[PDB]
Design a protein around this ligand. Structure first.
Ligand SMILES: O=C(O)c1ccccc1Nc1ccccc1C(F)(F)F
Lengths: 115, 114, 114, 115
């Protein structure tokens, strides 16, 4: 699993379940083309987004639909979504874990990169 | 000052100075059109981006060029930049403060609306 | 104003008002002796805790009563309080700003030293 | 595993390895008595701190020796350590995951509580 996304809820102290995640790859014409998508599981994790063969070097954007998540909980969020943009595999294949901690008016995101 | 941006450095424990910030407004055709831009001051703050008259309801994107900031410090950052996308509600007198705490592989952002 | 505290609310997107803050200094016998205290203002800030003369080198602990803050809002918090323990170096002119972003089950704290 | 601690490094984008962790329980005399201790593994995690039987209701303090961690990396940290104080099991046994994201002058901590 070269790309994994984990989302936590800072208000309820639990994984953020059923959060929609869309991944895009910057195309040759500087356009964002759909790469993969899914929803976080009961553990707040999303696996199987891509394969080592498909996950080539490039600039990727991980969009986390935080707005819909908070709306479903009856909380008016500030952000439309949380975006994480990064260059991947520019120096060989790596394993990426993109994590996000969500709050209605704030979010923190970090990345753990492994060989 | 309807919109203000503040950036901090979590590695050095100081304001993030000279950080480029670009603000965009979503156009009728779902395109991001330039709205305002500038660089954070010595206090890591950026004021005077817009006026109450110009800052109408809509979806705005604040792009913080974090990559260039870390590069200038000799640190390889993870993110290309930090983006904050939000809807300006306008309902009632409101000042928006977008703050971001930067680390090489992480960043936290919060909004203070008063 | 050598030491300043700022607290924000990540749930409501506003300053954390009326938050009790207690500052302690580690005594010669490794005990925490009261140093200063107060409550955050409408801007979520707390100034005038000490003076340059009184704020000598040493280990300080800033305790933020986060529990009471969330209780007053009807939210069951996880932490008893938020503690920030640091050493005041003094080496060179320095102002310390301790900031904390609060959520019911999480909090982030950073220090800005200028 | 009723109590687990996970520590990440926001500067290197990796788990924080070999971080000393001390857990204390507030005694009847308002004193902090040693409860358990250990060091994070290669995954930045610390398991086996206690058992369901030993982890009774009470106020616990998880002290993460962040200072030593940054010192070993040649970085002058701001905090002496990171402390997480919370009441546990006050309404029945729960599983607690205490996570911390570390930076030289900042740290974020969150808790994930499960049944
Ligand atoms: O640090 C400050 O002085 C500050 C002042 C105004 C607004 C935000 C600020 N800091 C900040 C910014 C983003 C995420 C967390 C914090 C924290 F944790 F610091 F609150």
């Amino acid at each position: 699993c070269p790309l994994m996304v984990k989302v936590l809820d800072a208000v309820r102290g639990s994984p953020a379940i059923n959060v929609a995640v869309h991944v895009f790859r910057k195309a040759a014409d500087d356009t964002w083309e759909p790469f993969a998508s899914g929803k976080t599981s009961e553990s707040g994790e999303l696996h199987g987004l891509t394969t080592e063969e498909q996950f080539v070097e490039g600039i990727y954007k991980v969009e986390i639909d935080t707005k819909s998540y908070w709306k479903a909980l009856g909380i008016s969020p500030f952000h439309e979504h949380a975006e994480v943009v990064f260059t991947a595999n520019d120096s060989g294949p790596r394993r990426y874990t993109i994590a996000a901690l969500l709050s209605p008016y704030s979010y923190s995101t970090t990345a753990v990169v492994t060989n």
